[PDB]
């Protein structure tokens, strides 16, 4: 399987556009956390399907598939958020019916912090002109590189996706020197995604402990499974 064919299969694994079915209106504190958690829960279901479409993922031990997903889900959700927000400076496009501004992120304590982190990282990707195919590889890598027999398979897969991103960059036809600089600049942003992911988990966990957010089984499981 060539890098191009692997990239194509990722495009095919792309989850569908998700909406929360909320009538356009101003955001308060309760309606905002209710929307974010409801959105995350719906996206989590599609994320599972997405992963299973990654060549080899279902070949891993069930223990690995679970640990990889339980640990990277928030980062993957945030990577998706940033790619959707790329062509909309200043806004976080969580969903078509859930578009938020920085100020609106003041209606919830501790969230403005993270919105700023996400907006800056999004702005950073925009400055680099992140291409769709690059986004695909990076997102796949986030899932396969969250690994804090089946192991060999994993390293093999991670390496395949890495080979794919190098390929995407090589096709842009830029100099070799600028291909390495671009490869590094993109990979260096993952540290920031991981960082904004850790804060987002801390915040959500706090909201959960306060029973301020409705019960969403898949989301509750992913939260506890990960917190623990």
């Amino acid at each position: 399987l060539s890098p191009e064919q692997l990239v194509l299969t990722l495009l095919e694994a792309e989850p569908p556009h998700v909406l929360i079915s909320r009538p356009s209106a101003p955001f308060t504190e309760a309606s905002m956390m209710m929307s974010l958690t409801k959105l995350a829960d719906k996206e989590l279901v599609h994320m599972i399907s997405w992963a299973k479409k990654i060549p080899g993922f279902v070949e891993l031990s069930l223990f690995d598939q679970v640990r990889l997903l339980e640990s990277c889900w928030m980062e993957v959700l945030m990577m998706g958020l940033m790619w959707r927000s790329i062509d909309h400076p200043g806004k976080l496009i969580f969903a078509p019916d859930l578009v938020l501004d920085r100020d609106e992120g003041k209606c919830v304590e501790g969230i403005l912090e993270i919105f700023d982190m996400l907006l800056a990282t999004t702005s950073r990707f925009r400055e680099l002109k992140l291409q769709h195919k690059e986004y695909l590889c990076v997102k796949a890598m986030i899932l396969l590189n969250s690994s804090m027999d089946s192991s060999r398979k994993l390293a093999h897969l991670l390496n395949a996706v890495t080979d794919a991103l190098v390929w995407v960059i090589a096709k842009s036809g830029i100099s070799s020197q600028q291909q390495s600089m671009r490869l590094a600049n993109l990979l260096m942003l993952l540290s920031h995604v991981r960082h904004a992911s850790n804060k987002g988990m801390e915040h959500l966990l706090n909201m959960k402990c306060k029973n301020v957010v409705p019960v969403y089984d898949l989301l509750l499981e992913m939260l506890n499974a990960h917190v623990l």
Binding site: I48, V58, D217, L218, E221, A225
Partner: peptide, 9 residues
């Protein structure tokens, strides 16, 4: 939940 979605389509 996660495990059942990982084992079914």
């Amino acid at each position: 939940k996660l495990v059942q979605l990982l084992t079914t389509t």
